[PDB]
């Protein structure tokens, strides 16, 4: 947080201070399977932020 | 009709002065009994026109 | 690329958001909104 958007606001947000830190890495080796990795979902609407 | 000659003299114009002109309410916000000074374009007094 | 440029309350505004206007009550210490300007104060008629 500090760079807000829509997807993060849709599904999961973090406190402004945000102690600790985050690491992001690609998973295209396994996640981008040909069959379609449809198990990943998220909430578009929940009546409020 | 374009580069024709009119019936003018050879422009001996005067340079009269108004001594108070050119104040035009620079801002639309109402002010009552305020000595606010503004930096904006104006016509100075005693100006030769 | 679309670039939006604008100014805030420099003059009588003509474009506003989806805010729905409510009725005004005088002589009551209430929050007041007017085209974006906010705060807390009582609203009274002024003959100026």
């Amino acid at each position: 947080p500090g760079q807000t958007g829509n997807i993060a606001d849709y599904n999961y947000k973090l406190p402004d201070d945000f102690t600790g830190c985050v690491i992001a890495w690609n998973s295209n080796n396994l996640d981008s399977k040909v069959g379609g990795n449809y198990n990943y979902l998220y909430r578009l609407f929940r009546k409020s932020n | 009709q374009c580069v024709n000659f009119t019936t003018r003299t050879q422009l001996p114009p005067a340079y009269t002065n108004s001594f108070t002109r050119g104040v035009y309410y620079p801002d639309k916000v109402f002010r009552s009994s305020v000595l606010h000074s503004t930096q904006d374009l104006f016509l100075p007094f005693f100006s030769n026109v | 690329v679309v670039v939006l440029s604008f100014e805030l309350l420099h003059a009588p505004a003509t474009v506003c958001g989806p805010k729905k206007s409510t009725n005004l009550v005088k002589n009551k210490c209430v929050n007041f909104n007017f085209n974006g300007l906010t705060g807390t104060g009582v609203l009274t008629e002024s003959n100026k």
């Binding site: - | - | 690329v1 679309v2 670039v3 309350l9 420099h10 505004a13 003509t14 474009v15 958001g17 974006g36």
Partner: protein, 48 residues
């Protein structure tokens, strides 16, 4: 209605100078200049 515009997706970059997405639908606008043009992929950062 800036709300629906922000509800849209696929924005290469979306930064607001002096305003915020939620406050966009709150304050009134004197006037706007919705400038429109097009540039290539790398030139997006050359804006601002």
């Amino acid at each position: 209605d800036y709300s629906v515009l922000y509800n849209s997706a696929s924005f290469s970059t979306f930064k607001c100078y002096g305003v915020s997405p939620t406050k966009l639908n709150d304050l009134c606008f004197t006037n706007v200049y919705a400038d429109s043009f097009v540039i290539r992929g790398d030139e997006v950062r050359q804006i601002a």
